[PDB]
Amino acid sequence: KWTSTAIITQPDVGQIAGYNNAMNVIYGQAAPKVSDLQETLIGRFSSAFSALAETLDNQEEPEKLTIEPSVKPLTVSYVGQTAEGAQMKLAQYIQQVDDKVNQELERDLKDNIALGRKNLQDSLRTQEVVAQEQKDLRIRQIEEALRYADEAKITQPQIQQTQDVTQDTMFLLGSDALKSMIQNEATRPLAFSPAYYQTKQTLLDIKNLKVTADTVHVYRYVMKPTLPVRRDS
Amino acid sequence: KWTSTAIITQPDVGQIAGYNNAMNVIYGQAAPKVSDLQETLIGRFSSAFSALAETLDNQEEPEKLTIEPSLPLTVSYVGQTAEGAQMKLAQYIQQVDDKVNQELERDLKDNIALGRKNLQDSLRTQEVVAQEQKDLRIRQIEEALRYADEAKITQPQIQQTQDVTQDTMFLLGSDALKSMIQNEATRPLAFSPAYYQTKQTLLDIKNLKVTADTVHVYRYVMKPTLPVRR
Amino acid sequence: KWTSTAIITQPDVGQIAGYNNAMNVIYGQAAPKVSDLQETLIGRFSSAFSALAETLDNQEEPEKLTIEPSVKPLTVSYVGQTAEGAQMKLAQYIQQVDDKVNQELERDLKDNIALGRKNLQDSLRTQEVVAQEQKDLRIRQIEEALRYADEAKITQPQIQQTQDVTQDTMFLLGSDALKSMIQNEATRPLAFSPAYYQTKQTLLDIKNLKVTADTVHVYRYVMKPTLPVRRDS
Amino acid sequence: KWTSTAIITQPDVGQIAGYNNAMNVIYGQAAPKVSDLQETLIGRFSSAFSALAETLDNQEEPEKLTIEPSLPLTVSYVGQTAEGAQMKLAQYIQQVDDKVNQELERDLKDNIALGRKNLQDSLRTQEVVAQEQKDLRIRQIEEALRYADEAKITQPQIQQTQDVTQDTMFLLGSDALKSMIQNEATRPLAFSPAYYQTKQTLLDIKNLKVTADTVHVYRYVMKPTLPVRR
Amino acid sequence: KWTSTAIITQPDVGQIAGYNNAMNVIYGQAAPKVSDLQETLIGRFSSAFSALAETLDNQEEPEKLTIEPSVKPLTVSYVGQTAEGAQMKLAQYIQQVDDKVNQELERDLKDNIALGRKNLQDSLRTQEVVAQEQKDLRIRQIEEALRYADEAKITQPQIQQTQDVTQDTMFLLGSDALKSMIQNEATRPLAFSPAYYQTKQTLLDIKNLKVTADTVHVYRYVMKPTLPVRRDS
Amino acid sequence: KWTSTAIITQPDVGQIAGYNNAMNVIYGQAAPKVSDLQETLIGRFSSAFSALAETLDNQEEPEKLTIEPSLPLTVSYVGQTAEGAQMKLAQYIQQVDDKVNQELERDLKDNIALGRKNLQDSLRTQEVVAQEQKDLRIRQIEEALRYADEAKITQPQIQQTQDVTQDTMFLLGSDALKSMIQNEATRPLAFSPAYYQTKQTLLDIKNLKVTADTVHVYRYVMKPTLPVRR
Amino acid sequence: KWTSTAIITQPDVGQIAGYNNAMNVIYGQAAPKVSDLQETLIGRFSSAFSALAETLDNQEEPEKLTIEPSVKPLTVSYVGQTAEGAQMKLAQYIQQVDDKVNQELERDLKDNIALGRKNLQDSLRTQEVVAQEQKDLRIRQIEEALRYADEAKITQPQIQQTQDVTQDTMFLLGSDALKSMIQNEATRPLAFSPAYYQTKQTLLDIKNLKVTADTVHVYRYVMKPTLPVRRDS
Amino acid sequence: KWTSTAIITQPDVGQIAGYNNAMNVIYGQAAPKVSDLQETLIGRFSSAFSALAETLDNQEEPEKLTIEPSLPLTVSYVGQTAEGAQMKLAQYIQQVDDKVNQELERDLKDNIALGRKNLQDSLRTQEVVAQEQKDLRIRQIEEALRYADEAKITQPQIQQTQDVTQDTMFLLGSDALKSMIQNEATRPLAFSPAYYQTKQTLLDIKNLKVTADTVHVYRYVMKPTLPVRR
């Protein structure tokens, strides 16, 4: 016989900064726009709140919880047996839904992070396979260059600057160096690209993420549950 | 007549991360956006659920299963007991879920198999092109040998290289040029970044493992209810 | 007096991967988006199915086949004289239409491939005409450079690195080499661009395409033709 | 009164590949997308067919030909016999098809002829610009000769070139610079990639061959029916 | 009492190629899309035809000319006193409007070309003023470099390659050359950019344009004026 | 009561080429598209014409002037004679045309004057920045002189230059570095392409000449009629 | 009993050039499009005019001022006791609103400029902190290079061109120079980027802005306040 | 019953410049456009004002506060005296203004604090990557030392450098290479532009100062009126 009401809306951008940051680490340029996250989050609360209303109606002693767009933020209400009771229950049910959806979001985020980590680790591995193939081919090129240097009887380097060399100019390094590059192939480091190090960077960032109760929020109060001064009618 | 209801919606992004990753490996920049994937997946469950509903009508004793926008979707089932309505709704949801998941998994494995084949063929044809380029390079070296012989340059005439062109190859000297020609068969091909990107994508597609965890097509907002009143 | 029904929708992306790949080889960046292909394909089945329904009505003994959007996938139906008969005929007519449209698609794809091949072959030819003109001009430049080298009495090369040369610096290669480059012009390879080799690559890919019954599909079952348990009414 | 009907739709992409290729040669990046071409072509058949219908009304004995959305389009013809309705519908479709194809073919040949002329003119004017650039280069060489004479540099003073500038041309030496000037008339023009792209497009436009296979404007979903009942 | 009708639509792309080309020379990347030109052109005919209809109604003896979208191409009509007369007049009035609008288009195009030519000529002039300022500044730099070379007593060049020089390295060319570059400044050619030569190219193309009766068209017949077989009613 | 009508529409592109060119000089990439300019201009005539109509209502003897879509526009005037209706309509169109043209011309001249001022100020501030950069370069040269003195390098130690850096300036030698410092006052500023683009735009804006031919705001599809009937 | 009317619309682009320029200096690529400024400005006048109408109605002796779209430009009106009075008051009230909104705009612009100046000044400061860190690191690199040069006993430079040096090739400058670069680190200028000088450029432009009564306008007359020839009715 | 009204609209761009600057520091290219910020801010005031209206209804003696489009917005309050209506409307506007401003300020400070933390963590992880790159460089130097020893190159063999590669590092000579290895611990890390951009953003975020002037959420078009009539 007494109705408490509250008005809620999307969480503020500062309050979801943690979640936004995590999404940007995971998805990069494909991460959702913050305004879209805001809509998604309040939407999730809204549908969960509506479901709770159904649960509360499906009782031997039904309870009346409502939610609907304020215009035509969201206006929510609860009908209680007393003014204090209605207010208290509305606050309780808002918190109940909040706790439920936050837990789901946190768990899904941790799942996402774990998968992203595994995928980045796998990507480093396969990128290393490719880099190893490239190194192996370079050693082959050096082996061929040694043939050419041996034919020209070039044992010492003929170039007077540090510079790129290709299959056709490698012989100019001279057979002394070329032989050493071949003999020591096993300890020659791989040539890793900026893209490879971007993968490592992302993996480090993903592993640094910590999902907590502060990471995301799904609503804010425009008006907290009211203590109705008059009974319904 | 007891009615059970449930409320379902699109799967969460974490729950389709495997599928999303696979689509990105297979399609690259043309892979669907995550939000679009979500809509597609719940849509697929939804049409399958409507189809089951109906199938269930086409029985000696027809059953009433429904689905409609409640954002999410509300599904309902009319049973002859409270527990029966709840249990059968849950079972029918799982039945549709299992069916759609199997179809998606098999289609994805098919897609991966074809992608692998296509990438392998691509490496083969790219190698044909790389071979033609090597063959032409050897011809350029053969011509540069003529020029070096005419200038009587047997040893390299350089102090650095800025990169090697048809017109300056002769400066490498006939001793080296002759050796490059003699040993052409053991000269490695010059592969491009695009070739290695093809190899990279092939390694990644072969690394995909499609399991029951790879994709999902719905999540519960509210599980099937046990109706308190008929 | 007995109605069988089925529900069908667009083919899955994995089931049209072959067709999609072929389209990407043929059209490159202009190839249709896979979702658009899906719509096109089911659309083609749909219109062919509707045409069949007209054909079946235009009979001394009319038959009733229907198709329409399920909502407010596509729902199709057939009205038969018995439950088993209706189901069997609906399945038959779906397969009949499927076979017809698949054949059209396959034949059009093979036509497209043949034309693409011819066009790529022609493009290689014309690109070679251009490359030949560029080589011919370079030989002319070398002829002029020989004049300059002869005037400066430069017979041996004056540069100490491999590098690009232009009309004004070609003379620095010296008249011995320049004369040889001119004398041997016929055996000087053409200078082919990355774009030229992209054309060759595409031609190789186009020739590797094989159109089969697995290449494309135009529908999938959401629900296979039903065996109706009750007569109409 | 017997009615025959047919169902037609846009031509297939394979069947307009020739026309599409030609449009791409002529217009490049501004060529219409294939799907747009398809819509344009069936649209052209459609308006021509309506026009024939309406013509056929304007007769001492009016005939009824129609076209409407069936998504595809449904066309119909009312004849005085079953075979007549079918035969005349097929003939009228072919009549319109022949008319539209001839118009498209002639317009495309006109477009190709003008494009050829435009490309040829473009090569001419580009050559005028290339000539002005060569003339200026010779003037730069004439000035560099002055500087080389003042420094008394007759032979080249370099070991490589990095890029050749007005200010460092003199390092090539007066012997070579004088020869470059003396022989200016036989110095080839320096043509750019854009010039060769113009030549490339000209070769390709000249390679186009417009035939009855080049374009199509419809395909049958269902050929004209033989009506079983009046 | 007799109505002749015709159906017309936008001119074909091949028939407006001349106009399209001229517009592309004048406006470059800002030239209208050919489909937009097509719409503009038929639109111009349409409004002129409607105006003629008003002119023909405003007569001591009114005549009835009509135009309207065929569906909800354009359908036009004329009502004459005889079948042959109606057809002949409709054809006449279509040609009359065609001639009028073509003349306007041709004259506006020639006006546009003349203005474009003047603007390009002016642009070459101002670009040359800028290039002259750049040359003047370079001569100043060379004057300063001569000071530095004189202080270091560098009379001969100290660099062994052709290369770019800047204010700080110009002195390495040596005072003999630097003095000559200064003494001969008047005959030093300006350094013109690719953008400058693009302006010259466009000017040459603009001057090559020739506007004729074939340059543009504004309609094509879908159906030529009919000879009505029956009077109205 | 005699009514005269005319049909008018947006000015042609050739007839607003001057105005379009000016807008492009002043605004560059932010200049309005031609088609948008056309719409803007006829729109301006239209509102001015409506205003004249409201003016003409607010008279001891009200006059009726109208404008409406024929999209083109149809304008009309109700006169007391046939010739009067025609003549007054033509005069009122010209009256509005003259008024709008004068406003556009004056506004454009204002815009040009401000643009000139802004470009001149921009050259001044850009020069301040260029001066700061020169001053810093001289400081770098002063430091390089210290390093050259410590290494006792008085003459240049190079054979080419690849860029000149703070750390390799000393290789130019103290004789030259000292001279660069001593003569800093006569060292020209190093101006960028952007600086010269500002100069270019200034020359072009100063070249604009606004005349009665620069812009137009309508064209006649049909001139005011002489009505044959009242 | 007498109504004066006027018609007004958005200010012309030339009349708001000053404001537009200021906005472009402040916001760069994010500055509003001029057409959007035009709409904003007339909109501001419009709402202020409507507010004035409310103020004038809220009087012991109400006055009737109106504004509304001409179709569903803006048409404004005032109802006075005489023809001359109505016209005079309408003109007065238009000017009154004009003065009010112009003052607000000017003050907000000056506020914006002051803040932009402060922000640019702060940005130069922080950019200098970064440049100083980069210089400090370079001095560290030079310190390490001195170690290497000392080990190789390289006191004089070994390179024969001006060029970039890195950590690994700095030693080639020789210990005499390297020691001097270290000893004189305090007087080594910072290495400022083009982005840094763009910040300085913008600051200079911002400081050159002068907001006056000519800077912006918010309306223009299509028709000035009329002197009504007849009373209302 | 006396009604006071006011007309309010979005805050001006100058009045939210602080907030806009902060958003740009924190979000960069993803920062909201100014016009969008304006709409967001007045929207926030508006919903808070509606909420106050309810609050004021839920009283033993209900009060009537309203807000609606006039765009701008018109707000009104019904009081029991003319001065009371005006005064209470002004107070309620200020009350809502104070509440929303405090929320925005606290949220912005929270956002800044998290951004600072995130940037600091980013510098740490970027440094881990830079360290791995340095460690690999030292390994390359260790290998180049082997090659130099084999060629017996102890002193540098170069006249310039074009960058330094694994394959040409040996030309620096074993004396220098050994020293580079011996002194690896004091070799500075090689930081990228992106690293310094992170440092730059951190300095700027730390420079932000959130005050009552940072943001505003409305401006008055018309202040609360003193109604002359009941």
Flag if F228 and E137 touch (Cβ within 8 Å). no
Give the alpha-carbon dihedral of D39, D41, D44, D49, to 10 degrees.
Answer: -100
Q: What is the DSSP letter of E160?
A: -
Q: Which residue from A minimizes the CA distance to B190?
A: A167
DSSP one-letter string for G97-156: HHHHHHHHHHHHHHHHHHHHHHHHHHHHHHHHHHHHHHHHHHHHHHHHHHHHHHHHT--S
Q: Which position has the token pair 């008018």?
A: F8
Flag if G47 and H34 touch (Cβ within 8 Å). no
d(CA B124, CA B117): 11
Q: Select from D101, D167, D181, D191 the residue whose CB has the most chain E CBs within 10 Å, as the one to mutate to test that interface.
A: D167
Helix (H, G, I), strand (E, B) or coil at C131: helix
Query: Checking DSSP bridges between strand H3-9 and strand H219-222, what pairing results, if any?
Result: antiparallel
Residue A162, CA distances (Å) to C56, D77, H161 in order: 81, 83, 5
d(CA G80, CA G65): 10
d(CA C204, CA E40): 44
Q: Which residues, 6 or more positions from G29, have their beta carbon under 8 angstroms from its beta carbon?
A: none
The token pair at A196 is 């490879």
The token pair at C130 is 């251009």
Q: Which position has the token pair 């069947």?
A: D15
Give the alpha-carbon dihedral of F67, F69, F71, F72, to 10 degrees.
Answer: -20
Partners of H207 on chain G (C-beta within 8 Å) are 122, 126
The token pair at H12 is 């001006």
Helix (H, G, I), strand (E, B) or coil at C194: helix
Strands ordered across the beta sheet of A74-80: A64-69, A74-80, A2-9, A220-223
Is the CA virtual torsion G96, G97, G98, G104 positive or negative? positive
Residue G183, CA distances (Å) to B57, E38, G13, G155 in order: 93, 75, 59, 16
Residue type at C129? V
Strands ordered across the beta sheet of E64-69: E64-69, E74-80, E2-9, E220-223
Q: Which position has the token pair 């988006």?
A: C33
Q: Give the minimum alpha-carbon distance from H222 to chain A in angstroms, rounded to a whole number.
A: 25
Partners of D204 on chain C (C-beta within 8 Å) are 122-123, 126
The token pair at E23 is 């517009």
Residue C28, CA distances (Å) to B25, B192, C110, E161, H204 in order: 18, 20, 17, 45, 45
d(CA F137, CA F143): 10
Give bridge partners of residue F161 from the DSSP assignment: G162
d(CA E149, CA E163): 18
- For chain A, how big is the Rg over CA atoms in Å? 32
Q: In this complex, which of G35, G73, G177 lies closest to F150 when CB atoms are compared?
A: G177
Flag if F150 and G180 touch (Cβ within 8 Å). yes
Element containing residue E6 per DSSP (H, E): strand E2-9
The token pair at C70 is 């399920």
Q: Which residues, 6 or more positions from G178, have their beta carbon under 8 angstroms from its beta carbon?
A: G142, G145, G146, G149, G170, G171
The domains of chain A, with CATH numbers, are 1-233 (3.30.1890.10)
Q: Are A126 and B204 in contact (CB under 8 A)?
A: yes
d(CA A49, CA A97): 6
Name all chains with 3 or more CB-CB pairs below 8 Å to chain E.
Answer: D, F
Q: Select from G127, G141, G158 the residue whose CB has the most chain H CBs within 10 Å, as the one to mutate to test that interface.
A: G158
Which of G31-35's residues contact partners 24+ apart within 8 Å by CB, and which partners? G32/H35, G33/F30, G34/F27, G34/F30, G35/F32
Q: Which position has the token pair 């003016």?
A: F55
Residue C101, CA distances (Å) to C27, C44, C105, D75, D79 in order: 22, 7, 6, 21, 30
Q: Which residues, 6 or more positions from H82, have their beta carbon under 8 angstroms from its beta carbon?
A: H2, H4, H226, H227, H228, H230
Helix (H, G, I), strand (E, B) or coil at A233: coil
Residue type at B195? Y
The token pair at C27 is 């059209």
Resolution in angstroms comes to 1.6
Our answer on whether G and D touch (3+ beta-carbon pairs < 8 Å) is: no
Partners of F225 on chain E (C-beta within 8 Å) are 54-55, 58
Flag if A180 and H151 touch (Cβ within 8 Å). yes
Q: Give the minimum alpha-carbon distance from H158 to chain G in angstroms, rounded to a whole number.
A: 7
Q: In this complex, which of H9, H178, H196 lies closest to G130 when CB atoms are compared?
A: H196
d(CA F31, CA E56): 42
d(CA E85, CA E65): 13
Q: Within 13 A of F61's CA, how many CA atoms are on the CB side? A: 3
Flag if C158 and D156 touch (Cβ within 8 Å). yes
Helix (H, G, I), strand (E, B) or coil at G59: coil
- Which residue in B55, B106, B67, B62 sits closest to B80, CA to CA? B62
Name all chains with 3 or more CB-CB pairs below 8 Å to chain F.
Answer: E, G
**E184-209 burial: b if 16+ Cβ within 10 Å, else e:** eeeebbeebeeebbebbbbbbbbeeb
d(CA B221, CA B218): 9
- The structure's method of determination equals X-ray
Q: E91 exposed, middle or buried (CB, 10 Å; 0-12, 13-18, 19+)?
A: middle
Q: What is the DSSP letter of E12?
A: P
Q: Return phi, psi of residue H57, to 5°.
A: -70, -35
The token pair at E79 is 């009502």
Residue type at F64? K
- Which residue in G170, F147, B158, F149 sits closest to H156, CA to CA? G170
d(CA G31, CA F72): 35
Q: Which residue from H minimizes the CA distance to G59?
A: H228
- Which residue in C66, C85, C62, C87 sits closest to C77, CA to CA? C66
Q: Which residues, 6 or more positions from H203, have their beta carbon under 8 angstroms from its beta carbon?
A: G126, G129, G130
Angle between helices B17-27 and A83-152 (to 10 degrees): 30
Flag if C50 and D7 touch (Cβ within 8 Å). yes
Q: In this complex, which of D14, D72, D222 lies closest to C109 when CB atoms are compared?
A: D14
Q: What is the DSSP letter of C152?
A: H
d(CA F166, CA C77): 84
Angle at C124 between CA C119 and CA C129, to 5 degrees: 125
Partners of C131 on chain D (C-beta within 8 Å) are none
Give bridge partners of residue B75 from the DSSP assignment: B6, B67
d(CA G138, CA G144): 10
Flag if H159 and A160 touch (Cβ within 8 Å). yes
d(CA H39, CA H22): 17
Q: Which residue from A minimizes the CA distance to H195?
A: A201
Q: If phi over 0 gives left and psi between -120 and 50 gives alpha, with beta otherwise, what is residue C174? A: left
Q: Within 10 Å of residue D76's Cβ, how many Cβ atoms? A: 17
Q: Within 10 Å of residue H10's Cβ, how many Cβ atoms? A: 22
d(CA D196, CA C137): 12
Our answer on whether F and B touch (3+ beta-carbon pairs < 8 Å) is: no
Q: Give the minimum alpha-carbon distance from B204 to chain A in angstroms, rounded to a whole number.
A: 7
d(CA D11, CA D21): 15
Residue type at F87? M
Q: Which position has the token pair 């010739």?
A: F83
Flag if F204 and E126 touch (Cβ within 8 Å). yes
- Which residue in E127, E129, E137, E138 sits closest to E193, CA to CA? E127
Q: Return phi, psi of residue C223, to 5°.
A: -145, 125
d(CA F172, CA F100): 66
Partners of B166 on chain C (C-beta within 8 Å) are 188-189, 191
Q: Are B111 and C19 in contact (CB under 8 A)?
A: no
Q: What length is written for chain A?
A: 233
Give bridge partners of residue D3 from the DSSP assignment: D78
d(CA A34, CA A12): 10
**End-to-end alpha carbon distance in chain F:** 6
d(CA H201, CA H193): 12
d(CA G31, CA A98): 41
Residue type at G23? M
d(CA G44, CA G38): 10
Flag if H118 and A187 touch (Cβ within 8 Å). no
Q: Within 10 Å of residue E145's Cβ, how many Cβ atoms? A: 30
- Which residue in B109, D85, D21, G138 sits closest to H191, CA to CA? G138
Query: Of all residues in chain E, what percent are helix, strand and coil, respectively (each to 5)?
Result: 60, 10, 25
Is the CA virtual torsion A115, A119, A120, A125 positive or negative? positive
Helix (H, G, I), strand (E, B) or coil at E61: coil
Flag if E9 and D47 touch (Cβ within 8 Å). yes
Q: Within 10 Å of residue A24's Cβ, how many Cβ atoms? A: 17
Q: Which position has the token pair 């070769």?
A: D203
Q: Give the minimum alpha-carbon distance from F126 to chain G in angstroms, rounded to a whole number.
A: 7
Element containing residue G57 per DSSP (H, E): helix G34-57
Our answer on whether C and B touch (3+ beta-carbon pairs < 8 Å) is: yes
Q: What length is written for chain E?
A: 233
d(CA A153, CA E211): 72
Flag if D156 and C144 touch (Cβ within 8 Å). no
Angle at A68 between CA A67 and CA A71, to 5 degrees: 145
Strands ordered across the beta sheet of C64-69: C64-69, C74-80, C2-9, C220-223
DSSP one-letter string for D168-230: TGGGG-HHHHHHHHHTGGGPPP---HHHHHHHHHHHHHHH----TTS----EEEEPPP--S--
Q: If phi over 0 gives left and psi between -120 and 50 gives alpha, with beta otherwise, what is residue G10? A: beta
The token pair at B23 is 């689509």
d(CA F19, CA F13): 10
Q: What is the DSSP letter of E231?
A: -
Q: Return phi, psi of residue B133, to 5°.
A: -65, -40
Size of interface C-D (CB pairs under 8 A): 126
Q: In this complex, which of G163, G177, G223 lies closest to F147 when CB atoms are compared?
A: G177
Query: Of all residues in chain G, what percent are helix, strand and coil, respectively (each to 5)?
Result: 60, 10, 25
Q: If phi over 0 gives left and psi between -120 and 50 gives alpha, with beta otherwise, what is residue C139? A: alpha
Name all chains with 3 or more CB-CB pairs below 8 Å to chain G.
Answer: F, H
Q: Which residues, 6 or more positions from D160, have their beta carbon under 8 angstroms from its beta carbon?
A: B162, C159, C160, C161, C163, E160, E161
d(CA H18, CA D221): 65
Is the CA virtual torsion H213, H219, H225, H230 positive or negative? negative
d(CA G160, CA B38): 63
d(CA A58, CA A77): 17
Q: Return phi, psi of residue B5, to 5°.
A: -125, 155
The token pair at D179 is 């020869």
d(CA G50, CA H7): 10
Helix (H, G, I), strand (E, B) or coil at E218: coil
Q: Give the minimum alpha-carbon distance from G206 to chain F in angstroms, rounded to a whole number.
A: 10
Is the CA virtual torsion G7, G11, G15, G18 positive or negative? positive
